[PDB]
Amino acid sequence: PISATMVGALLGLGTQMYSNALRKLPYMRHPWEHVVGMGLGAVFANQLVKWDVKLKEDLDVMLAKARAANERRYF
C-alpha cells in the first residue's frame, strides 16, 4: 500500500517537472532539485499525516467538551 511517501515523493517530482515545463524548459533540466522536490514532498506528506492525526484527536476532545457543556442545560 501507499505509505504517504510513494505519494509525497511523486507529487514533489510532479510539481518540480510541472514548474519546469511552465518555463518552457526540458522536463529534467535540473535533476538535483528533482531529488530535492521528491524529498520535500515526502517530508511534507508525512508531516501532513501526523498533523491530521493530532488535529483529529484535538477536534474530538473539543467536541467532547462542547457536548458536555451543552448537556448541562438539561441537568
Partner: protein
C-alpha cells in the same frame, strides 16, 4: 494434469468468503447507522453554548480587576483617607 482441474480451484481461491462478506456488511451497516445518529446529534448543537460567559476564558476580568483596584486612578474616594492608620 489438465487445464480445467487447475482453473477450477484457481477460481475458487480467487473467490472470497461470503460469510465474511455478510458479517462485514451487517457490521458496516450497524456502525454506519450509529455514526449517522452521532452526527445528527452533533449538528443539533447551537452556535452559542448554554454556559458561554460562565466559561473561565470568557471572564478575563473578575480575576484581573481585584489586583488592579489598588492602583491610582481606580480607588474608591474613601480608600486613601483612612489608609493612613
Amino acid at each position: 494434469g489438465f487445464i480445467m482441474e487447475f482453473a477450477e480451484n484457481l477460481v475458487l481461491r480467487l473467490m472470497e468468503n461470503p460469510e465474511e462478506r455478510d458479517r462485514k456488511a451487517r457490521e458496516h451497516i450497524y456502525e454506519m447507522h450509529e455514526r449517522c445518529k452521532k452526527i445528527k446529534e452533533m449538528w443539533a448543537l447551537p452556535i452559542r453554548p448554554y454556559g458561554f460567559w460562565t466559561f473561565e476564558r470568557h471572564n478575563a476580568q473578575l480575576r484581573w480587576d481585584p489586583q488592579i483596584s489598588q492602583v491610582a486612578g481606580r480607588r474608591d474616594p474613601y480608600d486613601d483617607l483612612l489608609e493612613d492608620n
